[PDB]
Scaffold this active site. Structure first.
Site, PDB file in Angstrom:
ATOM      1  N   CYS A 160       6.768   2.361  -1.525  1.00 57.47           N
ATOM      2  CA  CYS A 160       5.434   2.040  -1.970  1.00 57.47           C
ATOM      3  C   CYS A 160       5.438   0.993  -3.105  1.00 57.47           C
ATOM      4  O   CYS A 160       6.343   0.909  -3.941  1.00 57.47           O
ATOM      5  CB  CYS A 160       4.788   3.351  -2.429  1.00 57.47           C
ATOM      6  SG  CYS A 160       4.791   4.657  -1.169  1.00 57.47           S
ATOM      7  N   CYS A 215       2.628   4.260  -5.489  1.00 52.79           N
ATOM      8  CA  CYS A 215       3.147   5.369  -6.272  1.00 52.79           C
ATOM      9  C   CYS A 215       4.443   4.999  -7.037  1.00 52.79           C
ATOM     10  O   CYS A 215       4.404   4.366  -8.092  1.00 52.79           O
ATOM     11  CB  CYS A 215       3.264   6.573  -5.304  1.00 52.79           C
ATOM     12  SG  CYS A 215       4.241   6.121  -3.863  1.00 52.79           S
ATOM     13  N   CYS A 268       1.913   9.462   2.912  1.00 57.51           N
ATOM     14  CA  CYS A 268       2.410   9.765   1.610  1.00 57.51           C
ATOM     15  C   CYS A 268       1.210  10.293   0.819  1.00 57.51           C
ATOM     16  O   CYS A 268       0.112   9.734   0.813  1.00 57.51           O
ATOM     17  CB  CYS A 268       3.049   8.495   1.076  1.00 57.51           C
ATOM     18  SG  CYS A 268       3.350   8.658  -0.707  1.00 57.51           S
ATOM     19  N   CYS A 326       0.974   8.392  -3.160  1.00 58.78           N
ATOM     20  CA  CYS A 326       0.188   7.172  -3.142  1.00 58.78           C
ATOM     21  C   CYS A 326      -1.146   7.316  -2.374  1.00 58.78           C
ATOM     22  O   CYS A 326      -2.028   6.465  -2.511  1.00 58.78           O
ATOM     23  CB  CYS A 326       1.100   6.084  -2.563  1.00 58.78           C
ATOM     24  SG  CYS A 326       2.316   6.654  -1.348  1.00 58.78           S
ATOM     25  N   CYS A 362       5.802   3.552  14.544  1.00 60.29           N
ATOM     26  CA  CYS A 362       5.267   2.347  13.903  1.00 60.29           C
ATOM     27  C   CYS A 362       4.868   2.643  12.444  1.00 60.29           C
ATOM     28  O   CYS A 362       4.240   3.664  12.167  1.00 60.29           O
ATOM     29  CB  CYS A 362       4.114   1.806  14.765  1.00 60.29           C
ATOM     30  SG  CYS A 362       2.919   3.086  15.251  1.00 60.29           S
TER      31      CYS A 362
HETATM   32 ZN   LIG Z   1       4.652   6.969  -1.815  1.00 65.09          ZN
END
Ligand SMILES: [Zn+2]
Length: 143
Positions: A40, A43, A96, A99, A119
């Protein structure tokens, strides 16, 4: 808005179109692509190794597993998941929670779920390579 830049090179509006296609004139995509990982920029956490990248078929942003962690790590990762078979046909999707990045998904090809393709879309995600002179992760210093 109020621009020409973002209209000529969109980001959040571009990746959301690339969520279904490949394209020619691939440019930076016409050369080699190294090993490494993805994380990310929303996050904290690295989550996907480029080692599982679907090379020698399309080279496209798919991951033959979401590879780096196992079993014990399904609480540690801060990732969550949601299945949908409710249109009469099964799909799998992942997020996630750190985030709130709902960016990873996995769908069948026609046969058994052994043929699945996973994907993942880069709309809020960055990457670090495997090999040095671009990898430089730990200190190299002295007294
Ligand atoms: Zn994350």
């Amino acid at each position: 808005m109020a621009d020409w830049q973002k209209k000529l090179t969109p980001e959040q509006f571009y990746v959301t179109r690339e969520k279904g296609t490949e394209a020619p004139f691939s440019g930076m995509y016409l050369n080699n692509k190294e090993t490494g990982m993805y994380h990310c920029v929303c996050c904290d956490s690295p989550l996907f190794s480029s080692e599982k990248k679907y090379c020698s078929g399309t080279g496209w942003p798919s991951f033959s597993e979401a590879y780096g962690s196992k079993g014990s790590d399904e609480s540690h990762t801060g990732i969550l998941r949601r299945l949908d078979t409710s249109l009469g046909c099964p799909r799998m999707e992942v997020v996630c929670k750190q985030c709130e990045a709902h960016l990873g998904h996995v769908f069948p090809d026609g046969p058994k779920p052994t043929g699945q393709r996973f994907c993942i879309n880069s709309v809020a995600l960055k990457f670090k390579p495997s090999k040095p002179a671009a990898a430089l992760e730990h200190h190299h210093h002295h007294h």
